[PDB]
Amino acid sequence: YSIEVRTHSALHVVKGAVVKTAGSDAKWTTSTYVKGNKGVLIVKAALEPDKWGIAAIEALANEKVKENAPIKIYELPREEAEKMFGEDMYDILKVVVIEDWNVNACNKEHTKTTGEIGPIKIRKVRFRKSKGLLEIHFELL
């Protein structure tokens, strides 16, 4: 797999890892970004994490990677998708679903399973109190 195909599949894993810890406080992904082996996820959240709740994310991320879960893909019509899933899928349709972790209508090339992507390490986490946003830098090995 390409260095960025992997990277991009990580976005979904990291996202689900965020949802697990933050719960409802992960309001939505405002944006993402990919460059080489390095990625950035930006989420709208009320409060900021506490070092523990940052290691927890890198941990949940890597845990999902270590259980080599299938990155399920559905190419469904405009509707039908919405009945099967719903609001939780937005930021014909191409929907990427990591069972019980993340549902996302992404439109790019992904690895087949979480294993392929490999180890995820969180580099830096920035919070903007001004805007209510959480920025999460990471890269693969």
UniProtKB/Swiss-Prot annotation:
GO biological-process terms attached to the record:
tRNA aminoacylation
SUPFAM superfamilies from the UniProt entry: ThrRS/AlaRS common domain
Cofactor dependence: Zn(2+)
Enumerate the GO terms in the molecular function aspect: aminoacyl-tRNA deacylase activity; aminoacyl-tRNA ligase activity; ATP binding; metal ion binding
Pfam families, alphabetically?
A: tRNA_SAD (PF07973)
Record note on cofactor: Binds 1 zinc ion per subunit; the homodimer seems not to bind zinc. The zinc is probably not catalytic. Another report suggests the zinc is catalytic.
User: Any one cellular component term from GO for this entry?
Assistant: cytoplasm
Q: Which residues make up the binding site for Zn(2+)?
A: 8, 12, 106, 110
Which Gene3D superfamilies does this chain map to? Threonyl-trna Synthetase, Chain A, domain 2 (3.30.980.10)
The UniProt keyword set, sorted, is: Cytoplasm, Metal-binding, Zinc
The cellular location(s) given in this protein's UniProt record come to: Cytoplasm
Question: What binding partners and quaternary form does the record give?
Answer: Monomer and homodimer; the dimer is less active in tRNA editing and does not have a zinc ion associated with it. Another report shows only a monomeric form.
Recorded family membership: Belongs to the class-II aminoacyl-tRNA synthetase family. Editing domain AlaX-S subfamily.
The protein's job, in short, is: Functions in trans to edit the amino acid moiety from mischarged charged Ser-tRNA(Ala). Has little activity against Gly-tRNA(Ala).
The name this protein carries in UniProt is: Alanyl-tRNA editing protein AlaX-S
Which organism encodes this protein?
Pyrococcus horikoshii (strain ATCC 700860 / DSM 12428 / JCM 9974 / NBRC 100139 / OT-3)
Gene encoding this polypeptide?
A: alaXS
